[PDB]
Structure formats: C-alpha cells, structure tokens
Amino acid sequence: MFTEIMRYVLDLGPTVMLPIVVILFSLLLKMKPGDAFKSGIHIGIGFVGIGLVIGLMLDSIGPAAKAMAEAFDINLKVVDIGWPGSSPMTWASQIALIAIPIAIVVNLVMLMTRMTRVVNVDIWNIWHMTFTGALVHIATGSYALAIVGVVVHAAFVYKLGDWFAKDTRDFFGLDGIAIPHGTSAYLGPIAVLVDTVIEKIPGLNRIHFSADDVQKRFGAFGEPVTIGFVMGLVIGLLAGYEIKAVLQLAVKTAAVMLLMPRVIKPIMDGLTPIAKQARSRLQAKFGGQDFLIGLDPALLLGHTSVVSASLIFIPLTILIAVVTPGNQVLPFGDLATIGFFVAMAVAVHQGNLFRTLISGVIIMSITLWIATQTIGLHTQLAANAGSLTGDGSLVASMDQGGSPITYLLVQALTLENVIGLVAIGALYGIGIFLTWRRAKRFAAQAES
C-alpha cells in the first residue's frame, strides 16, 4: 500500500503536493479556508515559476557550459552527470521510497525533542538522503547501515537548515524559511570555516568586494542584470557559440537573474500569512522560537549575488577541475546550476565576492576530489538503477557524488581510505563546529 501512495505523492510534485501540505497546515492553524487556499496556490505558482526559470537555466546555460567544458582540452574522462542525472538514478534505488518516511520520521522525532525547528515539507529533495543511503548500501553492503546513513544525513541537513536560518532570513530575505536541502546547505560549513580562517588572517580580511561595489564602480553597467548579461556573453564566447547564440544566451542569463526573484516572490507572499499565524499560535503553544519551513534550495537563486556567482563559477569550476590534484571528474551536468554549491557561501560572507570566490574555489576543489573518490560507488549505483550505458563508462556526479556527508559516512563505515577520511573529516568537522558555534552566537545575540 505504501509504495504506490509514495509514488503518487512524489509524482504530484512541489507544484501540487506542496500547496496541499501548506493548505493542510493552514487549516490546522485555524485560518479561513479562502486564505489557506490562496496561500497554497500562491506557493504552487511560485514553484511552477521556479521550475520554469530553472528549466531555462538548464536548457540555456546547461548546453553552453557543457560545450565550454568539452571545448577546453582536458584529460578528465569521467563526466559529471550532476543532479539532473543523479536524482532520477537515486529515485530508482531500492531504498528510494522508504527514505521519505524515514526522513519524515526523523524530522518529527527531532521536532518533538526540540532538537530542530525546521519543518521540512520539500520531500522531493529527500533524494539527497536517499543518495547517501544508497551509496552506504553499495559500499558496506548492509541494509541497516543504509538506513543509518539516511537517518544521519537527514538529521544533519535539518540541523544545517536550523543553523543557516539567520542567513536565509537576513541575507536572502526568506523570513521563516529554512533551506536544509541541496548542496548549499551541506557545503555551507566549508564556507564558514573559510570565512573564519580569512578573518583570522590580517590583510585578507580587509579585502571587500560586493555586488554593490561593482554597481558603484561601473554606474548603470553595474546593475545585476548587466552583470548577468556580460557573464552570459563570456560563457557564450568561451563555449564556441556563434554571435547570435552568444547574444541569445546572454539575454537568457540576464533574464534568469531578473526573473528568479520575481518567480520566488509568490512563495514568500503565500507563506507570510502562514508564518504569521504559526508564530502567533503554534510558537506560543510550544514555546521557543518560530518554526521554519524547509524548502527547495532553488529559493537561494533569488539573490542576485547567488546568480552572479553561479555564472562566474562555471569557467572557474572547469579551471578548478583541471587544477585539482587527483581529479578525474569533468563538471558537466552540475555546471548549469553551479550556484547551488556556493549559494550559502555568498550568504556566509555577506555577499563578499572575494571571500565568496575563495570559499567557492575550496568547495569546488573538495567536491571534485570527493566525486573522484566516489566514482566507483556512483558507477555501481548507475548499474543498479539500470542507467549505465553499454560500454560501462564510469559514472560520477558533483551534486551528490561529491557530497562530504556521503563520503564521510562511507569512509567511516568502510575505512577504505583512512588518510582521506581523516583529512576531509577534520575539515568538515571543524566547519560544522564553527557553523554551530556561529548559529549559537547569532541566536544569543538575537535573544539579548
């Protein structure tokens, strides 16, 4: 019974199921049915528009970035299929369906114990937890260890959405919204560690370069739209595109950056009365701070600095992949939405594109090395899901193949690479401790 119900709910999508969940929550909050329905349909509309602009990204910058990647003479044989290739592969796994109830049960358990405030409703990003569990299952060979990996990933991402709540509220303006999923949430700790290290270092901490600085320096050509147009021009030129294709891609990138906030605005409009009623009634009933709603990481693309970093980092990601030692993954499928990796890095640095560039370089290097490490597990995952081609080419990805959580869990439960496990674990544990202390300090400051 459970299987087809979960499949139906997943197939409904964020467009339909998420408004249904929001309407149910609003009705449970004793709101008028008209307002509840209006908020629900507004959230559905916002997610439809998000899908439209994300498809525009994947269909315009996607092929352009891939053409740029192949254009440069490279020795990276394995291609990064990205989340467009990882997510269908992950949803075809054995534990794919049970991951949704496992993640929801974990979220509920941590909510009742007041270990988190993130009420995750975006169940279509539980394919990340599913990916972690599937790779653990492939490596160790134990179903119980796969479930343990799913539970650990879910708890970690909920706590990350809790810790980066201040950044989404202040920098991104998504008040009452957490972003626990995506690469941004679990690559944020690396950004926090880099920011702390830079602040410790004299001289480098003084270097500041925000998008507002670009605007003030370049006048009317420093607007976010002009930056997106110029970045699209650069991408098209590097990709070997013709002048017509270059200009069309440039206008499409500028349109992406102008239209992400516009299509994300309906979600905020729908959720604002819901959040107000929640903080009025449920927060008072249960005490503590207001509960956050966990949503898609595509909301982070509303910020213009995030889209600017997304456009800038495509050539930077390819250059990093060439530079990074012991890397065999060529970033192919994740290049279209490479801003997901550095979305939280921008927020941590308050939009400082210098610090953002440093953190993004570190993050991309780490993710590419981790993807190189998990090439074998990802190929086995493709073979299990049936997506492996006849030639048996190696499969690797950066959205989830390069996730530090998955690699750390696999190494901890297998110990196949002691030195790499120690290094990545030390770096990520320091990042986690730093981001937890940072969130605790921000909460203390807000309370005072």
Added chain:
Amino acid sequence: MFTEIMRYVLDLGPTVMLPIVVILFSLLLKMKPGDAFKSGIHIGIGFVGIGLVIGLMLDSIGPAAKAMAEAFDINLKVVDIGWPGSSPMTWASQIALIAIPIAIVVNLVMLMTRMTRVVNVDIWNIWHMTFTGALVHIATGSYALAIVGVVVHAAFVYKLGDWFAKDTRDFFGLDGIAIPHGTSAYLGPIAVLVDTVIEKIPGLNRIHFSADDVQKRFGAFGEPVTIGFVMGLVIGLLAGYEIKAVLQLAVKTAAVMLLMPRVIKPIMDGLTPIAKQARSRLQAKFGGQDFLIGLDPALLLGHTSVVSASLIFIPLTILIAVVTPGNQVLPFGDLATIGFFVAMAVAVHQGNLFRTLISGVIIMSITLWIATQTIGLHTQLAANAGSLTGDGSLVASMDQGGSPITYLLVQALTLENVIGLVAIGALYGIGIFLTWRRAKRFAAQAES
C-alpha cells in the same frame, strides 16, 4: 545577401534583435548609453519571460485543450493547426522574406505622411501580413496581387494599432505601446461592432459582469489566481485527465495568470524612459501625439481578465465549432492561446465579461466559418511549404486562416463567393468604421 541578413535577424528574434533596435532608438534620442542598454536588456528579459510563460501555456493548456477536442464526439475532420503551425508554414513561403522590407517601408511611408503613429518594431509578427499575401498569391496567382495584399494588411494593422491605442494605454496599462499584430488587433472591430449593437439594445446594455464583480461575489476565491485554478480544473476534468494531471494543469494555469504580468513588467520598465524621452524630444520635433511602439500581442495576456477569457473560451470555442453552421475546422492548435482572439474584445468592453462573451462567441463563429472557407487555400499553402502530410489531409487554422482580412482580400480579388464576401465585408467594414469613429472620438475627448 538580403535573404541571409533577413533570416539572420529573424533567427536573432525578439529576445536579441528587439533590444538592439531599442538601444539604437534610444541612442538616436541622445540618451546615455548606460540607460539605453539597460532599457534594451530589460525589454529582452521581458520577452524571454513572455516566451517562457507562453511555452508553459502551449505545453500545459495546449495538450489539455486538444484532449478536450478529441474527447467530445465531433464531425470536424479538419484540425486547426493554429499559429504554432501557421507561422512556420508562413515563414517558408516565397514572399516570406520580402514581406519584412515591404511592411517596414509601408510603416515608414505612413509615418512620414502622418497617417499613423505606430512605430512597429515586432517584425516577427509580420508573418501575419506574409500569410495574407501568400493566400492572395495562391488564390489569384499574381505576385503583384500578393504584394498588394501584404501592403493592405500592413497598413490596416498599423491603423488598428493606432485606433486601439487608447485601449492598450488605459485598459492594459501599456502606455506608449500599440499592439497592431495578432488576432486581437484585427478582431477588435468585431468587438466594437458588437459593443455598439449591445449598447443600442435596451436591457442588455445594463447587464454588467466583470472580474471585480466575481471577486466581490466570492472573496479570496474571487481572486484572479483562484479563477485560473478553477478554470484549469475544469479544463483538466473535461479533457479526461487524471486527478494528478488535473491538479498539475490547474496550478499551471493559475501560474500562467499570476506570472504573465510579472514577466511583462520588465518590458514596461525598459520602455518607460524611452517613451518619456521620445515624447520630450521627438514628439515636439515632429508635432502631433506621442508615437507608439508596436509589439507582440502577448503583451495583452498580462491582464487577468484576458487570461480568464482565454481559459473560459476553450470549451466555448469547441462548443461554437460544433454549433457553427457550415464549419469543418476543429479548433486544435489555437486553443492554448485562444485569448489572443478576444484580448481586444475584453478591452473594448471595459472587461465586461458578458459583453466579452458575446463578442467572443461572434468572433469565434466568424473565424471558424472563415477557416472553413480558406481550408483549400491553407492546404495549398501547406503543400507549397512542404509541411503537408503524405495522406494529403486538409489543413486549416484559426489564427490566420480565419482572419477576416485575408478572406476579404481573397474574395475581393477572386470573387469566389459573392454572398459570403458581401456579408463578411459589410460586417467588417461596419466594424472598421465604428472603431475608427470610436478612436477619433476618444482622441477628440483627450484633446478637449
């Protein structure tokens, strides 16, 4: 050379070429290059967003409406390919490329003689004039007569955009923008005639029903978004779609209605400083009223009443096609954007949905009868363009096959159907005279 450059500009398309023309106009107005470029890229972004939402319409309500057309047991063998099928067919015509310089020369000649104020820049809708000329060429067999038809259609549509300038400025809020192209512009005279007849008739003129009336009647459920959601539900239910498909389509239609104005807003934001500079300098230099910029009829989809009529008229269009005497065309491809037919009908009636419904029924009946009349010419056009299938099935369309201009010109130059020509010519000439007198009266009132 000329063919190559014309094809290159057409392939550049509204996304790129229109910003280039706008930037050139702004530079000719002695504006700063930064503001000129910002306006141009904003217009390009607006047109990218318009294309995104139009693609959403054609990919969600398109197949749903086609499934509705199949679902009802009908005897209309010939299917309406619509403008998605007519425009590629038209651009493959012999006169397709020369139509652009012919239309631009006609526009310039009428501008210098002060016969119009519409500066048409949307050259990708010159395929309407091309369609008229191609059908005239097929019927009469004379190249000169085809050129005459193209010239007549171009002059007529520029004058229509001039006459419906008040409706675009006031009802749609597109100040300083004319909409001379599309089915809305040349089906507006029928709406004007219907409105005049209704106003003459006592009792019926007192009946008023607007979207605001629905909003006041219902509440949060009278919101335009709720109307779009309900209409999507109805379309999905009638199409035989499953509940998941029904709900996804409903949210997509509501998203269309909420997102069309948002993606149209960049065009207005970009064009406002240009219009201000134009009315400041060029209008004073050349006297008269401010010149209007002719753009895509998709700008008329920003209004929520227009999208509501678009959604409502799909089942109405199918019912009319069944009812209409001597009709053999089943509305298939134009159903997704059937609001283009009544976009100006809404504006003429000040959003009165009862009057809009009457005008739309009359307009759809007329267009379906005309498409039935021009089935043969459209089939010959398909054979000429090579798009005709092997079985030689009849081809007809409603976007341009059913245009009263094309049918009137063909009948005037061929005298194939004397009675039908007389009837349609009398009706359309009365509509043209009424809309010209209406525009003249509005201009006189504004002057006073």
